[PDB]
Amino acid sequence: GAMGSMERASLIQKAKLAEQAERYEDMAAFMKGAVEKGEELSCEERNLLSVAYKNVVGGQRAAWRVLSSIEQKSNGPEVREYREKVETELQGVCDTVLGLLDSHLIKEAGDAESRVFYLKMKGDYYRYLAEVATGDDKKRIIDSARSAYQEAMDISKKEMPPTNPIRLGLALNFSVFHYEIANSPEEAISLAKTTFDEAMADLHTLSEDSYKDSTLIMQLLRDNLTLWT
Amino acid sequence: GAMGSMERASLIQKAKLAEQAERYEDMAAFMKGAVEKGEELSCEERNLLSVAYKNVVGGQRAAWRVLSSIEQKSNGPEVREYREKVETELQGVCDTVLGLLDSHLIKEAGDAESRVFYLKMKGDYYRYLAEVATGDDKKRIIDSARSAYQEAMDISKKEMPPTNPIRLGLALNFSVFHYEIANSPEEAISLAKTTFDEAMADLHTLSEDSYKDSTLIMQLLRDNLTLWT
Amino acid sequence: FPATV
Amino acid sequence: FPATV
Ligand SMILES: N=C(N)c1cc(-c2ccccc2)c(CNC(=O)c2cccc3c2OCC3)s1
Ligand SMILES: N=C(N)c1cc(-c2ccccc2)c(CNC(=O)c2cccc3c2OCC3)s1
Ligand SMILES: N=C(N)c1cc(-c2ccccc2)c(CNC(=O)c2cccc3c2OCC3)s1
Ligand SMILES: N=C(N)c1cc(-c2ccccc2)c(CNC(=O)c2cccc3c2OCC3)s1
Ligand SMILES: [Cl-]
Ligand SMILES: [Cl-]
Ligand SMILES: [Mg+2]
Ligand SMILES: [Mg+2]
Ligand SMILES: [Mg+2]
Ligand SMILES: [Mg+2]
Numbered sequence: 001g002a003m004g005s006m007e008r009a010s011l012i013q014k015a016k017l018a019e020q021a022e023r024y025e026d027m028a029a030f031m032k033g034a035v036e037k038g039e040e041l042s043c044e045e046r047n048l049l050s051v052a053y054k055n056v057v058g059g060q061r062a063a064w065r066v067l068s069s070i071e072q073k074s075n076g077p078e079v080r081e082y083r084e085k086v087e088t089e090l091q092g093v094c095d096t097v098l099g100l101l102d103s104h105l106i107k108e109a110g111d112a113e114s115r116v117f118y119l120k121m122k123g124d125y126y127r128y129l130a131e132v133a134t135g136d137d138k139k140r141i142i143d144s145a146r147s148a149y150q151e152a153m154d155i156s157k158k159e160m161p162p163t164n165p166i167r168l169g170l171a172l173n174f175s176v177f178h179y180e181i182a183n184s185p186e187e188a189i190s191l192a193k194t195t196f197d198e199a200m201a202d203l204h205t206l207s208e209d210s211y212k213d214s215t216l217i218m219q220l221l222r223d224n225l226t227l228w229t
Numbered sequence: 230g231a232m233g234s235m236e237r238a239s240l241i242q243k244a245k246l247a248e249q250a251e252r253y254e255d256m257a258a259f260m261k262g263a264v265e266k267g268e269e270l271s272c273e274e275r276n277l278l279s280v281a282y283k284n285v286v287g288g289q290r291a292a293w294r295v296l297s298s299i300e301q302k303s304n305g306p307e308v309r310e311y312r313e314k315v316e317t318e319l320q321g322v323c324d325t326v327l328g329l330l331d332s333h334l335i336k337e338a339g340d341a342e343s344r345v346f347y348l349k350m351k352g353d354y355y356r357y358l359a360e361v362a363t364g365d366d367k368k369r370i371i372d373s374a375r376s377a378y379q380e381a382m383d384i385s386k387k388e389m390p391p392t393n394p395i396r397l398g399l400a401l402n403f404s405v406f407h408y409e410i411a412n413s414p415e416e417a418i419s420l421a422k423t424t425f426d427e428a429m430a431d432l433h434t435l436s437e438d439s440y441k442d443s444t445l446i447m448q449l450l451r452d453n454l455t456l457w458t
Numbered sequence: 459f460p461a462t463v
Numbered sequence: 464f465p466a467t468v
Contacts, residue, residue, distance in 0.1 A: 010305070010307050013305070013307045014307055014310075014311045017296060017299065017307070017308060017311050018311070020295055020296075020299070021291075021292035021295040021296055021315070022288075022291070022292065022295075023292050023315070026311075026314075059251075062250075062251070063250035063251065063252050066249055066250040066251075067246060067249075067250055070246065070249070076239070076242070078239050078242045078243055078246070079246060081243075082243045082246050082247070082255075085255075086250070086252070
């Protein structure tokens with residue numbers, strides 16, 4: 001790792017500076033270096049890791065979608081080659097994240113909160129791989145995302161209240177998986193609705209701060225349901 | 230050059246695809262490869278080169294400003310180190326662009342339109358170097374930007390009408406140089422006003438398309454003057 | 459395109 | 464910050 005010579009605390013600090021500078025590729029590299037120090041991550045550190053790579057892969061996905069649409073309208077080799085270039089870099093980022101989860105974030109995560117967070121991430125990055133996959137690896141990728149998401153759901157329902165923001169975001173993303181990847185829009189709609197209603201009924205238990213956290217994600221569930229019905 | 234094995238036409242095509250995908254680092258790399266083929270650039274190709282690197286260095290400048298402000302409020306080594314990292318990458322991009330202009334875009338540019346375009350770029354990238362420079366290299370950088378801008382101005386006034394969009398943009402940027410780099414706000418204001426008024430008086434000569442081109446840049450001159458008075 | 463977090 | 468092109 002090019003970050004192996006930097007102190008863990010300095011890597012975290014620089015990840016926070018990169019975030020403020022909207023330098024998400026740097027941020028992700030700093031957080032990768034932090035993970036590779038081998039210690040567990042705190043909640044804030046998990047959020048830093050997730051924000052960094054979500055932004056990196058998000059830009060790659062947006063670019064891939066633009067190029068894929070151009071490629072589709074066109075059907076020279078240039079559009080395909082350049083789509084393939086972006087696709088390969090995107091898969092590389094996903095493989096990097098999944099590698100971090102497998103070596104060794106998931107196995108070392110004892111607390112429910114951390115294990116759910118990382119299994120959700122594993123579902124997310126297999127989902128991003130599935131978006132660009134074509135073939136027999138596609139089915140295996142899709143089922144792998146589902147298994148990670150469902151294991152995270154089972155833990156979150158045992159160990160977290162229905163308003164917990166990681167539980168809510170897991171459900172939000174798994175719902176999107178059902179709708180856009182698994183061709184299961186009724187499953188997606190049922191999951192977002194049940195998640196929303198269960199959280200609504202639990203809001204009475206929350207402080208003002210927790211209420212803010214939970215209703216932010218509940219709004220995204222409602223935003224998707226409005227789009228889907 | 231990593232792009233040496235790709236056809237010139239394919240590099241241009243991929244630069245246009247990168248632009249649509251908002252992949253400006255790729256775009257700049259494709260256009261660098263195109264320049265390095267050794268042939269002159271057309272107007273569209275010059276615009277592609279300029280847009281690509283303007284976006285790359287623009288992001289670097291925005292990040293540098295965020296980090297420099299944090300550094301300033303703080304006055305550990307981390308903020309300085311990371312500001313220095315971004316600064317070094319920014320200087321590297323500027324050195325790359327200036328290298329392309331010197332090997333050999335400027336010397337091969339016979340037409341006034343092309344020579345003005347490249348001398349304006351040379352002023353711009355020395356200006357970006359000046360923004361981050363501290364010391365005796367700072368003065369030399371500033372005077373170098375001024376000389377490039379002024380040579381471009383002299384050519385543009387001899388060879389282009391006052392509404393020509395490259396002439397207008399040169400004047401816009403040289404005005405900004407005077408205001409923010411040379412500590413010469415009256416020079417900046419005088420240049421933007423005279424440029425604006427001369428162009429206003431020439432709008433009667435333009436087709437509907439040319440009128441659109443010119444008034445777009447005239448609006449930016451007015452935007453800056455409003456900000457400065 | 460739908461929201462995810 | 465002022466406009467440039
Ligand atoms: N630097 C960062 N980006 C974060 C630092 C911490 C943090 C955690 C614990 C302790 C201290 C800081 C974060 C906790 N998540 C949020 O606040 C949040 C807010 C709005 C929306 C979402 C959020 O998460 C995903 C979606 S995000
Ligand atoms: N058990 C809880 N309810 C939380 C405990 C902590 C925590 C804080 C400090 C230290 C340790 C834990 C939380 C930090 N906030 C978030 O993560 C957060 C906030 C808003 C929205 C989202 C969030 O995450 C994904 C989406 S939420
Ligand atoms: N791909 C691109 N980004 C461009 C391709 C061409 C082009 C040139 C000649 C022939 C064909 C295309 C461009 C000419 N500039 C503009 O239109 C323009 C419009 C608005 C504002 C600005 C502009 O320039 C700098 C500031 S920009
Ligand atoms: N002599 C002229 N007036 C032009 C000739 C050509 C041209 C077109 C095709 C082929 C060759 C030249 C032009 C292409 N438009 C631009 O460059 C342009 C348009 C709007 C705004 C800006 C622009 O550039 C910087 C800022 S402008
Ligand atoms: Cl390519
Ligand atoms: Cl650094
Ligand atoms: Mg140490
Ligand atoms: Mg443990
Ligand atoms: Mg050839
Ligand atoms: Mg020539």
